[PDB]
Amino acid sequence: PLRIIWGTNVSIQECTTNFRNFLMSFKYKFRKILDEREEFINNTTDEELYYIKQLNEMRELGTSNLNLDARNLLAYKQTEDLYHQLLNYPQEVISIMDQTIKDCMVSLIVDNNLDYDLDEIETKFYKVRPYNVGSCKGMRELNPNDIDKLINLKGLVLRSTPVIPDMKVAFFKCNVCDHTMAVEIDRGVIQEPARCERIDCNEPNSMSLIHNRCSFADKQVIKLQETPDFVPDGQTPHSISLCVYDELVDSCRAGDRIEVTGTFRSIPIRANSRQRVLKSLYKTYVDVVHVKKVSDKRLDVDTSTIEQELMQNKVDHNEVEEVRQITDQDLAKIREVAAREDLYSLLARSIAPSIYELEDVKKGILLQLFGGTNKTFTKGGRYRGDINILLCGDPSTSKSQILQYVHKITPRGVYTSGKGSSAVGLTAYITRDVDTKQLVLESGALVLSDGGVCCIDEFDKMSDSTRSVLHEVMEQQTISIAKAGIITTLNARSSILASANPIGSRYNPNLPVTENIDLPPPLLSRFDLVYLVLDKVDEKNDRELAKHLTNLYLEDKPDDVLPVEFLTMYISYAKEHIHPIITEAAKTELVRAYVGMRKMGDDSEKRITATTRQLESMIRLAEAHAKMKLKNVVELEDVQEAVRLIRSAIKDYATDPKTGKIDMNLVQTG
């Protein structure tokens, strides 16, 4: 009748037939009608055979990994049971799926009589990587009956071990007759031959294992800090160990947010090194099957920071994607949206729809997200287009909401608070690993946020010693550590977004701007944009803000703004493909603006005088504005907009040049 693997409900023949029928007959319209998306169905994408075309392009590029969405299995009628079998029994079902992929690979070239050779396909090993296997349940909510099941976990990578050689074939040689054999590992156990296999030599205990002749596989252990969707009462964040093997080794860097799907494993741990006695309480971990580093809600990583990592990814053939793919239709949409005359206001308005107005603040945040162009000298110098923003403001001005939004939108930033962080915790430290009892180096908040935005709330409350770490980060985008364990230069290419209050917790018009900000000039000069966010009471402004806040609570789930997915992919495309350059007309405008504001600083501290870092900030903001409009050159109007944003951020029009005071009524428009 029906043959079933013991301990499962899995039939090999039934699973192969169901999965092969799924591969031959699945269309994405089934996924659309599963997700109750009928109006979004289009013929040209959905009607074509999805897994057939992925198999075809997988043959054409020579790749061996297939990414399988498990939700698609639940979409198809015949493979509804196969979805539950894949979740419950991944070890057998995944092997069955690999065999079925290889069968479809040979069948596609035999059936269509293609010129591809069968021997080259047969020698390759094909493996499938399932993902989106279910909801990201809490890791601590899993039970022992969930062992050896497929799970999803969202997490932040803290650190990874070096590559570990895991023995797969053992090489033995006879000491007397130099007779060699190779034995393949079986479930973690290698059987030493007690005697020589050759008929001539039969010396007992004569086979010695040669450690360098025998073959190994790559194994890496990564500490992942889980960020589950649901957190119960009084739960603190935890770190789990996840094991990656073979091509997935070194795919994940410290400080990036990933979707891990893998099997939930448990092993007994030896109580002592010399003893073979094991502990009854098991240690749990995840054997990783697939890693997703791309989210549609947030931006992708800056590829200028991972160029060599992309090269090593191509060498290792891991086939893990750091960046989302841009199709032709959505690229055409990007080019059409970039042609809009209201592009700046549309992009800034779509930053934080929940936050009302703060137009110039949103414009500065958008320019920080875009960034200036990155210039690397052939001699060895390096310029980074990272924009640092300070938001000094009165209470209840939604700047913490702005920092929260930026923390959600960035690929790998870190959110920190004033006096909740130390100088050591920002850069790097040494911890004792639980598994190995070894001292290991672990990155601090600034190094983890490299390639992203480090948001610092309550920046006014930070200690001066903790503040003084940020100088090298803001100016050189690096930290030069000389400590007992580490003496090296670490890249921290993190744009800093800080939020702060005045001394009296509210802005005092009697005091000048510098006293209200209360930052040392070396620190405050390194900020590209300083925003004085003020609360002016008006009839129309308060009425509009109150209406905007009350429209949120009309319904349980709450102009025209771009969607967050299109916003993220547009900023991603502009950062990846646009590297604007300064022209002569921009150069003369930059020089004239810097000279003019230096002349304004000549008048009699009370005021923030112009300094060369403001010229650098003008260059960076002009490059960011040019990158926004997809232009490959920085011309005069980009520099004018950068200068205008710098003037409006500090409210230089409102303040009096001589006194340095700000009067609320006579110029300010809320």
Binding site: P395, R506, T550, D556
Partner: protein, 166 residues
């Protein structure tokens, strides 16, 4: 949170900002701040004295015209109230907006005077909305009424201004 003024005893000579050693950002986070003044009087102290002596003598509460709700019964009623998810309509939103505008203008007027209790912020508006939703939750209603908003407003007003005026 429970606190004392800066001098330990409240004095009417100083501003209520002055003798409250609390920054404006931390002040704005508190949805309700109750000034609780110990003002001696012949009639109000006698009621307190008879209440406390009755509690010390019969080990229980004086007034026999009402029965206190047991803490477990209160806990389950509050749990059923917390299950509710009220929403606001157009009329209560308009009334809340007008109240917030009046509060902001009144605070701007009081800023120069000693009567000031701070500056009204959007956090004050959100606290009013939050209190109205809590009062709607107590009535186990899926909507917020005018009367709940007025009760929230009167709680906010008698929290600080009313006792300091007396």
């Amino acid at each position: 949170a429970a606190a004392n003024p800066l001098y330990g005893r409240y004095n009417p000579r100083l501003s209520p900002l002055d003798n409250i050693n609390l920054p404006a950002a931390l002040l704005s986070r508190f949805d309700i701040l109750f000034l609780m003044l110990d003002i001696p009087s012949r009639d109000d102290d006698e009621k307190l004295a008879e209440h406390v002596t009755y509690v010390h003598m019969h080990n229980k509460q004086p007034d026999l015209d009402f029965t206190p709700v047991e803490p477990s019964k209160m806990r389950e009623y509050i749990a059923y109230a917390k299950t509710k998810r009220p929403v606001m309509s157009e009329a209560v939103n308009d009334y809340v907006v007008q109240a917030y505008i009046r509060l902001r203008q009144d605070s701007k007027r009081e800023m120069d005077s000693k009567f000031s209790f701070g500056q009204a912020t959007p956090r004050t508006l959100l606290g009013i909305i939050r209190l109205s939703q809590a009062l709607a939750k107590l009535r186990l209603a899926d909507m917020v009424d005018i009367d709940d908003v007025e009760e929230a407003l009167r709680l906010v007003r008698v929290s600080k201004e009313s006792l300091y005026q007396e």
